[PDB]
Design a protein around this ligand. Structure first.
Ligand SMILES: [Cl-]
Ligand SMILES: [Cl-]
Ligand SMILES: [Cl-]
Ligand SMILES: [Cl-]
Lengths: 160, 160, 160, 160, 160, 160, 160, 160
C-alpha cells in the first residue's frame, strides 16, 4: 500500500544508522519509503520531496544526517507534517555537531529529535508509530503488544 | 472541551519557559491541560499521570524539565502516546545537562526532543499541533495559516 | 545472610562495568544482591524495587546506567536510602551524557555520583562500604586494612 | 552535642553555595561543624582535619570547592569516612572544571559527588542525613517527614 | 553602484551582530545589499536569493545565523559564489551550536566560517574585501591602508 | 604555470588530511604549490612565506594545522590575501582544539575556516576555486560542471 | 632597575585581567615591563619583542590573550626563555577557546599555561617569581613570606 | 650528580606518557629523578616529597596525572619550587578532566600546565630546561643548539 512514513538520509553512509528505522517500521507493518535526499548536494530534490510529501499521502518524515546536519530542519521548513530528526554519529565530534545542528531549531519550525546513532533511528520509527497509532487502532494494538513484549523481555539479573 | 494535549513541567520555575507552549496551543485553539509534575519529587504523581493519559483522551504529552531532566523520559516509559521533551535552561550548564538527559533515550522508549528553552517550548506545541493536524482538518487549516503567516511576516531588511 | 547492598543496572551491557562493584563488595564480605532493573523498559519493576528496599533490609543502593541515565535518580525518588550512581560509558558521548544525567539531581533528591566507568563502579562499592562501616566495627576493620594495603602497595618508581 | 558531620569549603566565596548544606543539617537537627579548609592554600590544615575526623566522632564529611577542586578528593585520601563532594560554580567554566575535578576519582578513593551549585550543597546534606538515618531512628523519622513534605508540597499547576 | 556583496541574516535579532559587517563594507566603500533571509521560515526566499546571486552580479555572500544555523550552508548549496558564514551568539549555548552547524559542512559544498559574534561579522566583511581586492586594484589599496592603520594604531602599553 | 594557490601545513602528519585539498586543485586544473611551514618550529619561514605570497603571485592560501593550531592565523597576520584554514583532527581532542584555535580570530585578521579533517581540506580547495572563478571564466565553467556533476551523482535510494 | 620579566598582552581589554600579574610582580618587587603586543595585528612587533627578549635581560615572559590566543605560543617560537601563558576569558566561549589555543602546544615549543582569567594572571606572576627565586636568595625569602602569609591568613570559618 | 629536576606520576600507566619527559632531560644532560607518587593513595608520601624537594636540591618538579588529576596541584601546595603539570590522557574524557583538574588552580598556588599527552610531557622537560638554562650557561648553549636543530630539521615539503 502507499507509504505513510518517509525515511530520508543524506548519503549511503547514513544507511548503517537509518536501516534500524526501516527495520522497525517493517516490523510494525507500517508502509514506508526509504530514499537518499542530500540537503547540500541536492537542495532542489529536497525542496520537491518535502513540499509534496503531504499531498503524496505521507504522514511523518524521518530524516537522518551527520555533521552540519541540515536535512531534517530544511525538510521541516517545507512541510507542515511532523518531521523527526536522527543525528548520525560523525567521525571527529561523535555526533555532537549532528545533534546541535538538528535539535536547536528556532521557534516556529520544529524537528522532534532523537538520540545520536542507531538508538535514535529505532526511536524515530517508534515515535512515528505512536503518532500513527493515534488514528489507526490496529497499529495501536500492535504497538501496545510491542511495548509489552519489550517490558516482559527484560531479564531479572545479569549473566556473569 | 476535553484536553488532547498535556503540558507538564517539573516546577514553577519551568513555567517561564513552558508558558510559550501553553500560549501556542491556545492560539491554535487546541484544548489542553497545563500541570506541574516532577519526576523526582512526585514520582507516583508522574506514574499515575502518564499511565492514565491515553484513557483520559490525551493524544500528545509535552514535558519540560532542566538539570537531570528525567520527566519526559519517565513519562514515555509509562505511556504509548508520543512524548515531546523540552530541555529547560539550567543555571550552571545552560541546558546542556537538560538536553543530554532528555534526548539520549535508549532504543525502545522514544522522546521527541526540541531546542533548549522558550524556542523548544513553542516548537513542542507546534509539533504537537502537526501531529493532531493529521486527523483534524479544521486544525490542519489553522496550522497552515499559522505557518503561512510566519513565513510572510519575515521582514526583507533589518531596521537600524 | 540477607543483602544490605543492592547493585542494580539497566541491562546486561552494563554488567561489564558494574561487575567491579560486585567484586569489591564480595572482597569486603558485604552481603549484596545484583539485579537488572531498567528505568525506561521496566519502570514499575523499578518503583517496586526502590520503595521496598528499606523494608527488605537494604542499606545502600548502587545503580549504574548510561546515556539518558535515569535509573539512579528515579531509584532515589522512591527510597529514603542513600543511592550511589555509576555513569556507564556511552558509545558516542563517552559517558558525558551518563554523568550529567546522574549527577545534576535537583535539591531534595540526592544521588552520590562516582566516576565514569569501572573506576566509578569500584568506588561506589567502596563508598557503600565506608557507609556501612560506620555501624559495623568488623567491616570497619576490614576496610581500614584494605585502604592500608592499597597505600602500601603503590610502587616507588616506574618500570621502564 | 558533638558534630557528626563536617562541612568544609575552600574559601569564604564558597559559603554562598555551602550555606545551603549548613541550613539543611540545622533543619534536620544534625549536629555539625562548618569550617574553611583549602587544599592548596592550607594543605596541612586539610591533612590534620581529615586524618583526625573519625577519632573526633565525625561520620560524614561534606566538602565544597570550585575550579581545580581538589578539596573533596584529598580529604578522602586521608580518611576512611564517606566524603561527599560539592562542585562550586566557577566564574569562567560554570562549574564544569569543579565537577570533573571532583567526580573523576581513581578507583580506591571514592568521593560521592552531587550537582554543581546550591542544589548539590543541599543534596550533600540530605545524602549525609540518609547515611546517618541508617543507625539513628529518630533522625530517620525526621528525614521521612522532610521527604514527605517535599513531595506533598509540590503544586499541581503553575501560577501565572 | 550595483552590490557585489550580499549580507543576509536570519532575523532582526541577528542585526546587532551583522551590522559590524555592514559597517566595514561601507568603510571600505564596497557596494553591498543587507537583507533578512531565513532558511527555515523563508526557505523559498533563500532558494531564490542564492540561485540568482551570481546573475545579479554578486561576488561574495556573507550569511549570519544562530542556533541550528542553516542559512550559510543552504545558501552555498544553491550558489557557486563563495559563501562566508558568521555564527551568531545564541542565548543558551553561546554560539557553539551556531559554530558547529555552520563550519562542519560536507566535502563538496564549502562555507568559509568566521568567529562567533561581532568579530566574525567584521572578519567576514574583511575576508570578502580581500577576495574582491584580488581583481580590484583601488580596493586592494584601501584594504592595504585599512590593515596598515590597524597595525599602526595598536598602543604600546596599557592605560590604567 | 606559476602557482596561484599555496597549500601549507605544519608537518608531514598533516599531509594525510591536506592531500585532499591538493587533489581537488589538480582536478580543477588550478596551479598551486604545496609546502611544509610550521608556525612554532619555523616562525621566520612562515613570516617570509606569508609576506611575499602576494608579490609571488599567489591569490589564496590554504593552511592546515592541528592542536594549538596557529599556522592559518599567523599566515593571515602577514598577508592581505584571503587565508583559508583547515583544522586537522588531533588525537586527544578530536580537532576541537584545532577548530577553536583557527576559527576564533579577532576582528581585523580573518581566517575563513572549514570543517575538521578531510572534508575541510576538500572544501578549502573548493572555496579557493570559487574565489578564483570570480575572475577566471574557464575555471568558472569547470567549477560549474563539477558542482552539477556532484548533484547529478547523488543516488536516489540506499543500497541494503 | 632593568626588567627581568616581561608582561605582554594582546589588547587594552586584556588589561582588566593582566593587571593582576602586574600587581603581584610589584608586590614582590620584581622589576618588570608591561606592554601591549598582538600576535595578529602586530606580528612584527611580536617577532622583535620575543627574539630580543634574552639579550635585553628578560628572564621570563608572561603573555595573555583570548579567543584564538596565539600570543604566548608565537612568543615561545622566537625565544628560548620560559614563556607562561594566561588564557583571557572570551565573551562567547568563556576562555575555553583561549585555553585550548594556548595549552595544546606541539612538542618542542613549550608554554606553561595558567588558569583562565585573573587567577591565571596572578599565578603566572607567582610562577615567574618561583623561577627567579631559584637564583635570587632575597626574592626567594620574599616569596616564602608571601606564601606563608597566604596560608596563615585563610580564615577558619565562614562569616554569615 | 644530584638531581635538579623531579619527575613524578601517580602510577605505572602514566609512564607511557611521562617517559618522554625523562628522555628529553637525559638528552639535554639534566640530572633528574623519576618516581611514582600518588596523591590519593599515598598522600603522606606526596606531602613529604614536595615539602623536602627544595632542601634536597631540586629546582623544578614535573608532575603527571590523569582523570581527577590532583598530583601537580597538591605538589605545588607544599613547595615553593616551580611545578609543571602534565595532563595524562584519560580513557573516557580524553584528558579533558585531566587538563581542567590541573590548569584551573586558584590564584596563589601555580601549576604551569602543558598539553594533554606525550607532547605535554616533552614540553614539560623543555620548559624545565629553559628555567634551568637561566643560571646554567652550558645547558643554555645545549638548549639553543637543540632549538636550532629542531628548526633546521623541518622539511620544506611533504612526501606523497
Ligand atoms: Cl527563535
Ligand atoms: Cl533545584
Ligand atoms: Cl576582537
Ligand atoms: Cl581564586
Amino acid at each position: 500500500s502507499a507509504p505513510v512514513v518517509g525515511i530520508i538520509m543524506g548519503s549511503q553512509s547514513d544507511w548503517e544508522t537509518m536501516r534500524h528505522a526501516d527495520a522497525l517500521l517493517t516490523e510494525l507493518e507500517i508502509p514506508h519509503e526509504t530514499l537518499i535526499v542530500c540537503a547540500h548536494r541536492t537542495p532542489d530534490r529536497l525542496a520537491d520531496y518535502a513540499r509534496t510529501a503531504a499531498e503524496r499521502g505521507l504522514n511523518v518524515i524521518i530524516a537522518g544526517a551527520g555533521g552540519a546536519a541540515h536535512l531534517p530542519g530544511m525538510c521541516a521548513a517545507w512541510t507542515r507534517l511532523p518531521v523527526l530528526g536522527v543525528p548520525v554519529e560523525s567521525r571527529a565530534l561523535k555526533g555532537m555537531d549532528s545533534l546541535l545542528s538538528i535539535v536547536q531549531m528556532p521557534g516556529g519550525v520544529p524537528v522532534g529529535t532523537l538520540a545520536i546513532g542507531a538508538s535514535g533511528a529505532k526511536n524515530a520509527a517508534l515515535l512515528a508509530a505512536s503518532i500513527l497509532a493515534l488514528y489507526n487502532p490496529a497499529l495501536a494494538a500492535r504497538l501496545e503488544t510491542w511495548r509489552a513484549l519489550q517490558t516482559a523481555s527484560v531479564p531479572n539479573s545479569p549473566i556473569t
